[PDB]
């Protein structure tokens, strides 16, 4: 079954990309050598196929959140909001390797390849949390297919499909936000501001001569330490953008869909970014469609009461021995 979550990000979206990306102070991405450049960590973008323009397919950039970030965000909000209060109201104590299997997609319960009988495969895929992702040494296929957060954008019209043409963006969706770090010893005003420093004026002066000597030595080398004074750039996806999120479940139970629904009920407090200091990735949910039928309201989720009762009786009955038996 399918759940499509249409959200708008209250704050910008930043999911950092690999590679060495350089921007000038004006904005030119990846300059030829021989000119001053700048460190830049762009948001994650894939080259996707485009039937826009002509009937032939052209490769266009599309700035997304990766699906792994979506999967881990959904996982972590189910653990932080419903799973952990249930397991600490009972007194359950997880183990590393079972906590690592539940909270991450890792096999450190036993690094060995654990054999999995088909009956135990069935009894762990029907678990309200465990069967969604799986993981661990069993390496069994989880039931939850979490897609990338795709912005409603004309470069993604092949990914988005028909029906999103209304309320659709176009053009550039990335803004290169420039950030910086200043050496705060240079910000020190007088004796009242410096009295908390051990050494005070002497220590502040010593750091100023150390930074000065390091900077002049680096500039003389230009014609290996590093100071605090930084100024860098990062591309973010623009705030207020609308995004679709596809969550397709491969033969789910009622309790698993109820767990995903209670994740969507409480995911307003979650963030989706590499900008947690800057409150990046705050979003509100505008629509949640189950099997094509919208279910989201302003006061949380209204509908799917069978899923809510199923997940209530699922999270009530868990005693974390199933997590330990899932790990080893």
């Amino acid at each position: 079954m399918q759940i499509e979550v249409t959200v708008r990000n209250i704050t910008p979206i930043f999911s950092a990309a690999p590679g060495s990306n350089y921007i000038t102070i004006d904005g030119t991405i990846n300059p030829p050598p021989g000119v001053s450049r700048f460190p830049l960590v762009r948001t994650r973008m894939m080259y996707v196929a485009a039937d826009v323009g002509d009937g032939v397919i052209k490769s266009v950039p599309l700035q997304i959140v990766p699906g792994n970030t979506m999967r881990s965000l959904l996982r972590r909000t189910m653990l932080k909001h419903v799973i952990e209060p249930a397991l600490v109201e009972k007194g359950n104590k997880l183990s590393i390797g079972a906590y690592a299997t539940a909270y991450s997609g890792n096999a450190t319960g036993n690094p060995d390849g654990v054999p999995s009988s088909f009956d135990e495969i069935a009894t762990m895929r029907a678990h309200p949390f465990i069967g969604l992702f799986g993981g661990g040494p069993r390496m069994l296929e989880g039931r939850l297919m979490v897609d990338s957060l795709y912005p409603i954008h004309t470069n993604a019209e092949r990914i988005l499909g028909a029906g999103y043409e209304n309320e659709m963006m176009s053009g550039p969706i990335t803004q290169v936000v420039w950030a910086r770090r200043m050496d705060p010893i240079l910000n020190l005003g007088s004796s009242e501001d410096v009295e908390v420093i051990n050494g005070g004026a002497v220590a502040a002066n010593g750091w100023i001569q150390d930074l000065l000597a390091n900077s002049k030595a680096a500039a003389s080398k230009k014609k290996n330490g590093r100071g605090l004074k930084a100024f860098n750039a990062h591309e973010v996806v623009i705030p207020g953008l609308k995004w679709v999120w596809r969550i397709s479940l491969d033969r789910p139970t009622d309790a698993q869909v109820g767990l995903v629904l209670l994740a969507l009920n409480k995911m307003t407090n979650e963030r989706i970014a590499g900008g947690h200091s800057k409150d990046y990735g705050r979003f509100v949910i505008d629509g949640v469609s189950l099997n094509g039928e919208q279910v989201w309201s302003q006061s949380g989720i209204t509908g799917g009461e069978q899923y809510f009762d199923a997940v209530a009786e699922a999270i009530d009955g868990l005693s974390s021995k199933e997590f330990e038996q899932f790990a080893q």
Partner: protein, 389 residues
């Protein structure tokens, strides 16, 4: 009241027009000169005209962007039009007064757009309170429809893509059903596509008019019947009229502000009945929705020579200027302009074959952008790839 509250099955004939009909319905227009002639049979509406003068784009897609004297003048218009005595005032005048007050009350709310246009006869004061967004009303029709079949002659964009179509009528994606189209070979079989064209690009210039008109003279000399030459504007068709008048004489029909499509079509049947070979500088409704298949020979379409030549003088870009199409273009971009031009050109090319069995049909495209190396005319080539030699 006139239709059932729930339609179990709705079939729409010529569905491509239907959204425009909704765009026709949700515009409430205030006509000033019939009001001024009716009141003589107030000064606040004259001041509304004087403040209406100060505001080639005159306030397009602006609901309330500029209202310096627009809303007190509208309020004085409403109060001086609604408080006139109904007793003694004529039975046909109250229709004009009521449609003007309904249009003014549609204007007052601020939920609608405002547009200005002038009549083809003279520069009369025409004002419009229309709706550029139409998701609510048409969605209120689709929950009131159980199932629907939308049948048209230009319904689909490219192959099995009809995404913009369910964007115009705001069809829900869950209830949408996209069937493969029927494009038979006999629609493209008798038609002959000619390689020659007009080398000048269409730039609303007299030199293009002379070179294009020499190509129309060539086609009309090689015509064994009627010829329709299709334009998108009044200015270029008056240029072609001034370039072909003394050249062609009585063979030509022009369309203008004083020449409607129906009068021109009737003259086309008239001088095809007389045995002469007409040419028709047609625009507007001459693109979409005219029957150029003769009814004097129903049973034998092999002798149909009422329209032996279709010539498209220019690609119809920038034809749809409605509020909903402007808003939809502002979302989509250049692609919606290109696909709407493709649909208008497909309706333009559909005037040639209207029934199977016809023979010796000629199609001409004189736009030099088509035969150029530009990529934006790429769909326009693939539809011309359905014809050969």
């Amino acid at each position: 009241l006139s239709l059932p509250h729930f339609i179990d099955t709705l079939i729409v004939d010529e569905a491509h027009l239907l959204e425009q009909a909704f765009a026709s319905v949700y515009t409430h227009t205030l006509r000033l000169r019939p009001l001024m002639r009716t009141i003589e049979g107030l000064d606040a509406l004259k001041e509304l005209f004087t403040q209406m003068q100060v505001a080639t784009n005159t306030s397009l897609n602006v609901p309330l962007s500029d209202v310096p004297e627009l809303i007190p003048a509208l309020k004085d218009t409403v109060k001086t039009l609604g408080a006139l005595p109904t007793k003694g005032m004529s039975r046909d005048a109250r229709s004009v007064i009521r449609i003007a007050t309904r249009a003014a009350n549609d204007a007052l709310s601020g939920h609608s757009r405002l547009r200005i246009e002038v009549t083809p006869v003279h520069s009369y004061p025409m004002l419009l309170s229309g709706r550029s967004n139409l998701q609510r009303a048409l969605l209120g029709l689709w929950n009131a429809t159980g199932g629907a079949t939308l049948v048209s002659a230009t319904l689909f964009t490219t192959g099995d893509n009809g995404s913009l179509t369910r964007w115009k009528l705001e069809v829900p994606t869950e209830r949408a059903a996209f069937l493969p189209p029927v494009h038979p070979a006999w629609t493209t079989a008798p038609v002959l596509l000619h390689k020659e064209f007009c080398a000048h690009e269409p730039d609303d210039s007299p030199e293009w008019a002379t070179e294009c008109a020499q190509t129309i003279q060539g086609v009309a000399s090689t015509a064994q019947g009627g010829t329709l030459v299709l334009c998108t504007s009044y200015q270029n068709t008056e240029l072609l009229a001034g370039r072909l008048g003394a050249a062609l004489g009585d063979r030509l029909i022009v369309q203008s502000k004083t020449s409607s499509a129906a009068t021109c079509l009737a003259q086309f049947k008239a001088k095809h009945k007389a045995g002469i070979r007409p040419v028709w500088l047609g625009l507007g409704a001459a693109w979409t929705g005219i029957d150029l298949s003769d009814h004097s020979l129903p049973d034998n379409p092999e002798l149909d020579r009422l329209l032996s030549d279709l010539v498209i003088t220019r690609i119809p870009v920038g034809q749809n200027r409605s509020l909903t199409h402007e808003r939809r273009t502002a979302i989509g971009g250049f692609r919606i302009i290109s696909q709407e031009a493709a649909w208008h050109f497909r309706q333009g090319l559909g005037r040639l074959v209207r029934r199977p069995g016809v023979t010796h049909k000629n199609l001409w495209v004189l736009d030099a952008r088509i035969y150029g190396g530009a990529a934006w005319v790429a769909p326009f080539r693939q539809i011309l790839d359905r014809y050969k030699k």
